[PDB]
Subunit: 105 residues, 8 copies
């Protein structure tokens, strides 16, 4: 019943530490409460490089939309997200459905 | 829900991403459900998640594995290759896989899973 | 309203076969259940042996519910394996119409 | 019969709302009458992100060429398009032929 | 002004010589008179491998559609193409517009 | 004979500037030294903001020598930085015409 | 002087061991003498999977052309290659030029 | 056995010679001792272009992780790497396992 969103960003060359600092020090404190279930947050060591992956869990897809909606209109997030966006070269996401044998489910 | 940490333990995460052959998803899943994960998990030691993509690249499976180091990973993946039940199991699974790739992810110090 | 874009690559030589299956059996089953087929296309210039189809929904919940109904439908279950063997690759995405999209 | 051109653009990080404002307030009023049959204009929510997709109907490809050539010589479009273009990281297109069971046909 | 179609096929591993034989001995003799203007036909030696590229000249895209439609209706092509298509793992095309300094224009 | 296909993606908005540079300055330096320009194209349908140019050579050692001469040419060293800044990505490949290829 | 060719293959799922068995026991004894300078032969453990990479050293690309010609025309190679090819899903290559600070050069 | 890492970078258009100057004159002297086993360093001439490839041999992935840790911490490297990184458009790595019949193994 739970769904997982995987977000995958390609960060501009040289800007990774900048990106992590903003999220570590400001972004995540705003975003996590609202979205509700940060599962994990990663920087790739082997594979595609200058890559961050974050996973978020949700009770449903319309719970997701409601939460993501609340985030988009949060004033602090509105101030924050333009500063992060300028460091992102490309992004994509996908909806993952856990199997009945997934520990995250 | 929330996680709570008091001391660091070093951990890496492997993401494996397979494109399954059209028409084979339920067969792939059934093999893993009924046989493979019961062999695989105890040996590799820390399964994190196992997913089928609903929006994105389709006929796609994604699974995550926690390890202490990359040598620990190598040690455990070598035990798995060496396991007799696995040797009989993996050829039946591998034939259903069109493509595969993996990568090593390092959790940030603010990752709940870490 | 949201639009799901599904994009399939079909096995070389099997395009007419795929379309025949959909035309004569699949779309009759699929369309009433899913509700709102927007378009169904074969690529002529671009990635080739490519089929693209678009479906409208009220929400992602609504989509999930309808597609679950489709997965549970006996005719679909008998049909989809014949179609799946012709699909070499597939992907999809969710599109939000802008406020100036004539389709919105 | 009718053909559909699908145009898929990757917009620079943080510039999506800027891009939309230009199209909403200027571009589309110029472009649409000349090109003739705007079918749809979308932003991707799940999949490749910071992506816009727009579809244009034409009676034939020679007619597409005539109309896109007209657009390119229009003096308002010339003044407009460079302001849009600096926000586009990547672009591509394709020619879709509707099936006899496509509602859009 | 002329247009050029570049068609790009990836051939199944081990099937190249078989693919080339079919085209050399059966296909191209049917195909070229009907499409009208075969420019070049190539096998990649360095790059994506087991790849053939072939380039076709047309006066216009409507002419292309008219000629490609005739090819599709031709009895000999219809008995032929299924044997070639089974060898094609993947395909794509694009329409190239020569520049005013292009030797081919 | 060998054909090299070079395929460039041009930064958004910079196409006309790329073509102007090559038209008025670049190709007059380049073609004589490289020796056999086959074609030069802009993609209208497919990957966009895309330039494709084809070059004929007697062999790959000849190519290496000729592209070597080009990179040492004073005029070309004065030109190429202005062109190069406009190219967002690039790739090339070597194509061997078949025995039934008109261009051979 | 010396050029490097990097060949990168994707092997059909489940066929890796069979592919290496063929190359180890029959292929490489034919191939390597004729091509002259096998630098290295690898299987990918992290990255794109079910992937082999082999690097060949050549004095020049004309010498490569001549030698690859000889290989293609070799009777032993001709008996061997079809059996390997059936296991190859896709392939690609590129020419690498060592820098003046490359130990391999 | 020994493991090989292949690092593959796409360099910004027009910045290649600037990239090589930095590595040739400063970077490689810092980096090669600390990592210990530079196999090769290449620029692609035919294939994906504006592409740099380098290879590093290691005894183990842990030993790799230790040496990359030392490399990261090195103060001369911290001053160098931001200057190189600004020229890199994208990067990726993979771990290769030499076959038992690879000369490099």
């Amino acid at each position: 019943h739970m769904i997982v969103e995987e977000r995958i960003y390609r960060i501009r060359g040289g800007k990774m530490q900048e990106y992590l600092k903003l999220v570590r020090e400001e972004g995540i404190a705003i975003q996590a409460p609202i979205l509700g279930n940060l599962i994990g947050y990663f920087v790739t060591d082997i594979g595609p490089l200058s890559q961050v992956i974050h996973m978020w869990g949700y009770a449903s897809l319309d719970d997701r939309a409601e939460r993501r909606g609340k985030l988009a209109e949060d004033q602090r997030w509105q101030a924050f997200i333009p500063r992060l966006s300028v460091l992102i070269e490309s992004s994509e996401n996908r909806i993952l459905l856990p199997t009945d044998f997934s520990p995250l489910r």
